[PDB]
Amino acid sequence: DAVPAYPFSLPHALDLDPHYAELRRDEPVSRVRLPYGEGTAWLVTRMSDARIVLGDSRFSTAAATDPATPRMFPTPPEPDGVLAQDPPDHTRLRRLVGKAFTARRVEEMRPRVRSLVDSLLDDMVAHGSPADLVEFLAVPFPVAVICELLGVPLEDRDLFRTFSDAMLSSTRLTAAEIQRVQQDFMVYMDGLVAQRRDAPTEDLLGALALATDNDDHLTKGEIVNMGVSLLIAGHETSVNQITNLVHLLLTERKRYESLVADPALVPAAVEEMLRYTPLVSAGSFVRVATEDVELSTVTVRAGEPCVVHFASANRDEEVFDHADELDFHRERNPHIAFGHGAHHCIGAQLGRLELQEALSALVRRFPTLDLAEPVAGLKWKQGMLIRGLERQIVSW
Ligand code: HEM
Ligand SMILES: C[C@H](CCC(=O)O)[C@H]1CC[C@H]2[C@@H]3CC[C@@H]4C[C@H](O)CC[C@]4(C)[C@H]3CC[C@]12C
Numbered sequence: 001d002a003v004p005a006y007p008f009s010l011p012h013a014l015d016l017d018p019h020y021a022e023l024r025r026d027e028p029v030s031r032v033r034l035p036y037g038e039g040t041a042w043l044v045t046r047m048s049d050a051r052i053v054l055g056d057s058r059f060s061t062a063a064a065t066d067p068a069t070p071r072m073f074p075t076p077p078e079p080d081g082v083l084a085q086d087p088p089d090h091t092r093l094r095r096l097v098g099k100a101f102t103a104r105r106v107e108e109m110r111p112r113v114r115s116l117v118d119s120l121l122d123d124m125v126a127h128g129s130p131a132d133l134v135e136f137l138a139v140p141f142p143v144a145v146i147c148e149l150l151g152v153p154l155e156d157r158d159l160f161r162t163f164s165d166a167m168l169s170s171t172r173l174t175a176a177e178i179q180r181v182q183q184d185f186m187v188y189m190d191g192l193v194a195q196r197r198d199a200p201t202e203d204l205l206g207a208l209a210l211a212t213d214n215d216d217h218l219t220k221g222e223i224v225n226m227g228v229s230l231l232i233a234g235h236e237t238s239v240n241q242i243t244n245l246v247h248l249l250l251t252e253r254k255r256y257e258s259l260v261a262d263p264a265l266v267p268a269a270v271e272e273m274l275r276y277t278p279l280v281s282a283g284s285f286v287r288v289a290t291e292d293v294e295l296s297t298v299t300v301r302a303g304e305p306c307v308v309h310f311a312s313a314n315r316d317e318e319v320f321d322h323a324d325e326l327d328f329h330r331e332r333n334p335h336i337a338f339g340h341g342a343h344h345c346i347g348a349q350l351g352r353l354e355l356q357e358a359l360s361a362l363v364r365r366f367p368t369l370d371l372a373e374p375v376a377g378l379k380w381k382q383g384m385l386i387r388g389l390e391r392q393i394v395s396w
C-alpha cells in the first residue's frame, strides 16, 4: 500500500509540518500508516471533523486496544487505562478522582501554587543569571504540584521521571524496553496505594485506596493505572508546556514585552499559546468507528480507525482568523489543546493554573528575561509523544 507514513517527518522546534495546511485545504481526511500496529488509519486535520471523532459514541477507544490496531506508540494500549475506556465505563472511572480536578477545587490551589512558584524563583535568583529554566522552574514546579495533589513523595522524582520519560516514547525506546518500565511503574503505584491500607491519606492516592475495597464496579488494575496516568500526564505536559510558552515569548520578544506591560493578559496569552503550540507530536489515541460516521469529505466505515492531529485543528482557518499568527487579543478561542468529548483532559484546569502562575511570576519579576543560548543549539526532545526543551538557559 501507498498510504503515507505518519508522522510525515521528524519535528522541527515548535513548527507544524507544512503538509497539515495542505491537507486542511485539499484533503482534510486522508489515509496514513501509523508507526505501530497493522493497517491504515484516517488522519483528521480540521476542527469540525476532530469534534466528531473525539465527541461521538460511534467512535470507541476500547476497540483500539487490540495489538493489531494502528497506534502512535510502540506498546499496545493498556486496556485498564482511562483513554481506552468508552462511556459509560469511562464516566464511572472518571468519578474516581474528578472532584479534585473541577475548576472550583483547582482554583482553591492557586495560593499554594503561587507560593511554590515564588520559592523556586527565589532559588533561581540565588543561583544568579544565567540559569537553566528547566532545572529551576519547568521540572521542579509541576512535579511539586502533582506530588502534593496525589501524595507521591517529592524525593521519589528521579525514580518516576525515569519511568515517565520511557512511557512517553514515540520512537526513542523499543516496545520491550517500555513494557518493562510499565510493569515497574505498575508495582510502584500499587505499593503507593497499598500503603494507605491501615493509614488513610487526604490526597488522591487516599481516594484510590478507599476505591480498592469500597467500589466493586472498578477493578484494581483500573484504579492503580489511574495513579500512573495522573502522575505522568500531571507533570510531563506542564513541564514541556512551560518551556514551550517561554520559547514562543522570547523568540519574538514582542510577546514577552506585551505581558510585562499588562500581566492581566497572561490568562488569554496562555489560551492562545495552548492553541498555537504543537505539544502533542503527532496523532492521538486511536478511535475506531463502531458504525459508519459522516465526516466532512468521507463516510468512515464501522471498523476503520481514525486519529486527530490536535495542533492542526488548532490552526483551522475556518475557526480562527489569521490562525498561523499568535494573538493574545483574539476574541473567540475554542481550541482543543486539551482535546474534546469524553476524554477531554481531566487536568485542564490544573494545566491552565500552573501555566498562568508560572508566566505571571516571570513577567512580573523578570522583565529583562532573555534566551542566553543560541536558538540553533536548543535541545528539542526527540522520539517522544510530546515536544519541549531538555534545557533553556535564560538571563535576566
Ligand atoms: C498543559 C497541560 C496539558 C495539556 C496540553 C494536556 C493535553 C491533553 C490532551 C490533548 C488530552 C486528550 C487525549 C485524547 O483524547 O486522545 C488529554 C487527556 C488527558 N490528560 Fe491532559 N493535558 C495537560 C495537562 C494534564 C494534567 C495536568 C493532567 C493530570 C493532572 C493530565 C491528565 C490527562 C489525562 C489523565 C487524560 C486522559 C483523560 C481521559 O481519557 O478521560 N493532563 N490531555
Ligand atoms: C502513558 C499514559 C498511559 C498509562 C496507562 O494507562 O497505562 C498516558 C495517559 C494519559 C496520556 C497523555 C494524554 C495527553 C496527551 C495525548 C496525546 O495524544 C499524546 C501525549 C499525551 C501527553 C499523553 C501521553 C501518554 C499518557 C500520559
Ligand code: NA
Residues within 6 Å of the ligand: 064, 070, 071, 072, 077, 284, 285, 286
Ligand atoms: Na492508540
